[PDB]
Every structure is written in C-alpha cells, then in structure tokens.
Design a protein around this motif. Structure first.
Motif, PDB file in Angstrom:
ATOM      1  N   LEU A 169       3.068   7.558  -5.648  1.00 15.20           N
ATOM      2  CA  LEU A 169       3.135   6.276  -5.025  1.00 15.20           C
ATOM      3  C   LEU A 169       3.484   6.441  -3.540  1.00 15.20           C
ATOM      4  O   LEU A 169       2.858   5.846  -2.653  1.00 15.20           O
ATOM      5  CB  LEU A 169       4.193   5.468  -5.727  1.00 15.20           C
ATOM      6  N   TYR A 187       2.553   1.043  11.107  1.00 13.59           N
ATOM      7  CA  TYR A 187       2.685   1.858   9.896  1.00 13.59           C
ATOM      8  C   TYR A 187       4.138   2.078   9.546  1.00 13.59           C
ATOM      9  O   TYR A 187       4.935   2.441  10.405  1.00 13.59           O
ATOM     10  CB  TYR A 187       2.055   3.188  10.126  1.00 13.59           C
ATOM     11  N   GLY A 241       0.594   5.704  -0.031  1.00 14.41           N
ATOM     12  CA  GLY A 241       0.720   4.585   0.906  1.00 14.41           C
ATOM     13  C   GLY A 241       0.734   5.095   2.320  1.00 14.41           C
ATOM     14  O   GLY A 241       0.868   4.354   3.275  1.00 14.41           O
ATOM     15  N   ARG A 242       0.591   6.401   2.436  1.00 12.78           N
ATOM     16  CA  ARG A 242       0.676   7.111   3.690  1.00 12.78           C
ATOM     17  C   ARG A 242      -0.685   7.672   4.038  1.00 12.78           C
ATOM     18  O   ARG A 242      -1.095   7.606   5.174  1.00 12.78           O
ATOM     19  CB  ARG A 242       1.639   8.257   3.468  1.00 12.78           C
ATOM     20  N   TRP A 269      -2.689   2.356 -10.385  1.00 14.86           N
ATOM     21  CA  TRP A 269      -2.398   1.276  -9.456  1.00 14.86           C
ATOM     22  C   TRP A 269      -2.825   1.602  -8.041  1.00 14.86           C
ATOM     23  O   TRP A 269      -3.286   0.707  -7.328  1.00 14.86           O
ATOM     24  CB  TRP A 269      -0.938   0.874  -9.486  1.00 14.86           C
ATOM     25  N   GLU A 283       7.064   3.898   6.867  1.00 17.91           N
ATOM     26  CA  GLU A 283       7.519   4.520   5.625  1.00 17.91           C
ATOM     27  C   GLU A 283       8.941   4.113   5.282  1.00 17.91           C
ATOM     28  O   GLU A 283       9.675   3.626   6.143  1.00 17.91           O
ATOM     29  CB  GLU A 283       7.275   6.026   5.536  1.00 17.91           C
ATOM     30  N   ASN A 306       0.530  -0.666   4.680  1.00 21.45           N
ATOM     31  CA  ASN A 306      -0.213   0.335   5.434  1.00 21.45           C
ATOM     32  C   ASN A 306      -1.733   0.241   5.247  1.00 21.45           C
ATOM     33  O   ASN A 306      -2.490   0.865   5.978  1.00 21.45           O
ATOM     34  CB  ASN A 306       0.288   1.738   5.095  1.00 21.45           C
ATOM     35  N   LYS A 307      -2.184  -0.540   4.270  1.00 18.42           N
ATOM     36  CA  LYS A 307      -3.616  -0.533   3.898  1.00 18.42           C
ATOM     37  C   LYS A 307      -4.407  -1.789   4.310  1.00 18.42           C
ATOM     38  O   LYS A 307      -5.564  -1.662   4.688  1.00 18.42           O
ATOM     39  CB  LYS A 307      -3.811  -0.206   2.411  1.00 18.42           C
ATOM     40  N   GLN A 313       7.832   1.099  -2.511  1.00 13.24           N
ATOM     41  CA  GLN A 313       6.721   1.967  -2.229  1.00 13.24           C
ATOM     42  C   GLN A 313       5.463   1.211  -2.456  1.00 13.24           C
ATOM     43  O   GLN A 313       4.486   1.413  -1.694  1.00 13.24           O
ATOM     44  CB  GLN A 313       6.769   3.227  -3.081  1.00 13.24           C
ATOM     45  N   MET A 314       5.445   0.335  -3.472  1.00 15.58           N
ATOM     46  CA  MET A 314       4.221  -0.482  -3.706  1.00 15.58           C
ATOM     47  C   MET A 314       3.996  -1.379  -2.466  1.00 15.58           C
ATOM     48  O   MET A 314       2.887  -1.521  -1.985  1.00 15.58           O
ATOM     49  CB  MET A 314       4.338  -1.349  -4.934  1.00 15.58           C
ATOM     50  N   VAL A 361       5.143  -0.868   0.647  1.00 16.63           N
ATOM     51  CA  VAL A 361       4.680  -0.015   1.748  1.00 16.63           C
ATOM     52  C   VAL A 361       3.156   0.249   1.631  1.00 16.63           C
ATOM     53  O   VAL A 361       2.420   0.063   2.607  1.00 16.63           O
ATOM     54  CB  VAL A 361       5.482   1.288   1.812  1.00 16.63           C
ATOM     55  N   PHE A 362       2.680   0.622   0.436  1.00 17.51           N
ATOM     56  CA  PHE A 362       1.270   0.916   0.232  1.00 17.51           C
ATOM     57  C   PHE A 362       0.392  -0.273   0.693  1.00 17.51           C
ATOM     58  O   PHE A 362      -0.546  -0.102   1.514  1.00 17.51           O
ATOM     59  CB  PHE A 362       1.052   1.307  -1.239  1.00 17.51           C
ATOM     60  N   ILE A 363       0.700  -1.474   0.194  1.00 20.00           N
ATOM     61  CA  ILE A 363      -0.035  -2.684   0.582  1.00 20.00           C
ATOM     62  C   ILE A 363       0.001  -2.881   2.107  1.00 20.00           C
ATOM     63  O   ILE A 363      -1.031  -3.107   2.732  1.00 20.00           O
ATOM     64  CB  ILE A 363       0.504  -3.951  -0.169  1.00 20.00           C
TER      65      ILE A 363
END
Ligand SMILES: Cc1nc2ccc(Br)cc2c(-c2ccc(Cl)cc2)c1[C@H](OC(C)(C)C)C(=O)O
Ligand SMILES: Cc1nc2ccc(Br)cc2c(-c2ccc(Cl)cc2)c1[C@H](OC(C)(C)C)C(=O)O
Ligand SMILES: [As]
Ligand SMILES: [As]
Ligand SMILES: [As]
Ligand SMILES: [As]
Lengths: 144, 144
Positions: free
Chosen positions: A48, B29, A52-53, A78, B31, B121-122, B114-115, B117-119
């Motif tokens: 995960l 971005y 995201g990185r 996911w 983290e 950064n994307k 982390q979920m 963060v993923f959303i």
C-alpha cells in the motif's frame, strides 16, 4: 531494459529482525523497512505504501507463499497491482554489505538500514547516473 | 514554481494517534506515516527514510521545535538536509478529508492513511497531471 512498473519484494533476516526490501528492477532503486516479523499484514501495508508513491504494475518475489495472505491479495487488488506470473539479484547481498559497513554508526538496526538504502540509491554507476536518478528518469520518460 | 528540493513536514492527530505528513511543495505529492507519538526519534527516522528516496535539500515545518532534538539534527546533518530558515496549506485539511472518506474501508487508521495518500498522489489536476507524476517530472527535469 525492463518495464518501469516491475518491482521485486523479499525479506532478509539480520539481528533476529526481518527486513522487507523492494527493488524497482529497471533502476536498482530500493526501499526498505525493518518489521518485527514476516506477516501478511506487514507485506500488505508496505505494498500500500509503495503503490501511492510509484506506479506499481506487477511485483515479483522469490517466495510466492509470501503473497498468499488474503490481506496481501486485498492490498494488491485495491491498488491494482498484479503479481508477476512471468519471471522464471543480488542487491540483498550488497545492501547487507552496505548495512555491515554503517552498523557502527547507529544503535538500531532500522537506522542502519535506512542509512544503507540512502547510500545505495545515491551512488553513481561505475561509469552514469544513480539508482535514485534512474528511477525518476525512467518513470518520467514513461509519462511524457 | 518552487525549488524541487523543498519539503514541508508536520504532524496531525486523529484517533489518539499521530500522523507524520511530508509534502513536496512544488508538486503537492505527500508521504505519510502513523507513529505512536511525536518524538524526535520518529521524526529523524522519517527524514532518513525520505532522504534516501528523493533529493531533499531543505525541509520546512509549522512547528520549529519539532526540529530541535539532537536526534533530528543528527539525521539532517548526516543526510545533508538544511532547514528552511526562509519561508514566513492546507493539504492537512484535505488529506484528513480523504481519510474521513475511506476510514470505513479499513480497520486500522494506518491503512486508511496510506489509502488516502494513494488517492491524493494519483488524482489528476482539475484540468493536468497528478501530484505523483508532477514530483517525478520536476525531479527528472532538474537532473537532465
Ligand atoms: C536512537 C538514536 N539516538 C541518537 C542519539 C544521539 C545522536 Br547524535 C544520534 C542518535 C541516533 C542517530 C543515529 C544515526 C543518525 Cl543518521 C541519526 C540519529 C539514534 C538513531 O535512532 C533514530 C534514527 C531512530 C533516532 C540510532 O539508531 O542510532
Ligand atoms: C487488518 C486487516 N485485515 C483484513 C482482513 C481481510 C481483508 Br479482505 C482485508 C484486511 C485488511 C485490509 C484493508 C484494506 C486494504 Cl486496501 C487491504 C487490507 C486489513 C488492513 O490492515 C493491513 C493493511 C495492515 C493488513 C486494515 O487496516 O483493514
Ligand atoms: As517477505
Ligand atoms: As499481488
Ligand atoms: As511532528
Ligand atoms: As533539519
């Protein structure tokens, strides 16, 4: 060489502790984390984090059973990671070398590891970018 | 806009737990990591982690006392980070928004983070790359 979205993920042991090590195969760039023990939950969470990185397309490992937790399947699902059904190096020996050299500089294994990762990602090739520069170049090139 | 080596580092609280949040200011971005409590040792270690991944020149924070641990000074020293004596946004409100929306999907606050963060950064800009693509473009451009 390789597709920019492939990573290799594995664990090594040192000092009674588990190190999880991700390698972006086209560049040699690694990230790494000391976890208390090899569980599916630790792996999922690291994936995960990684996803995201960077754009993570497929991940390979040298122990396929690492990847059988539902926890781990849930994380790959996911974040849209597919597993590498398609590769039949050693950085692990080398990063371990780098760890051995800095171990002195730090109390905790974890600090030594991150120090070792930093040195690895930054060294310029024997002749020549660094792993850190390479991953970023590869991934940007694959954008534009 | 901004110099490619500037980052902002801060902590927020949610669920009795501390979230440490790094923002690369030129891209957006982030983290992030859930730590058990705000200590100098946690900050140092996160900086060590961050620095072996990206070129980190200077870091800013909204609480300068965060950065007074010798632990923290030792990490900035070893990895060659300078502190930002030179800035007199909110992603924290927004990432917190994103966390609130996914919280459902996960048991642990850390996974939700982390979920989130993923959303972040994307997502592509309202019109237009994503934060993830931007950081990589900026940093590669500043290589070649
Ligand atoms: C516990 C610790 N205490 C310290 C006390 C004084 C000084 Br100067 C450095 C450290 C460092 C220290 C060591 C190396 C670097 Cl690069 C930065 C701080 C650590 C390191 O732990 C972290 C990074 C988690 C705080 C370590 O394991 O030795
Ligand atoms: C404890 C846990 N148990 C699970 C059991 C079944 C399934 Br399907 C998913 C999870 C997930 C789960 C949730 C979301 C995602 Cl994206 C992947 C796994 C977690 C998550 O924890 C980590 C990521 C540390 C294992 C969580 O906090 O809910
Ligand atoms: As493993
Ligand atoms: As997978
Ligand atoms: As903090
Ligand atoms: As600093």
């Amino acid at each position: 060489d390789c597709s920019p979205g492939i990573w290799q993920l594995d664990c090594t042991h040192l000092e009674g502790k588990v190190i999880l090590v991700a390698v972006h195969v086209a560049s040699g760039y690694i990230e790494a984390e000391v976890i208390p023990a090899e569980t599916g939950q630790e792996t999922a969470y690291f994936l995960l984090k990684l996803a995201g990185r960077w754009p993570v397309k497929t991940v390979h490992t040298d122990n396929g059973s690492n990847f059988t937790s539902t926890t781990v399947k849930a994380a790959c699902w996911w974040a849209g990671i597919k597993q590498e059904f398609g590769i039949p190096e050693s950085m692990n020996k080398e990063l371990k070398k780098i760890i051995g050299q800095v171990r002195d500089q730090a109390e905790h294994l974890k600090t030594a590891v991150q120090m070792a990762v930093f040195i690895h990602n930054k060294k310029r090739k024997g002749g020549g970018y660094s792993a850190g520069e390479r991953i970023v170049d590869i991934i940007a090139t694959d954008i534009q």
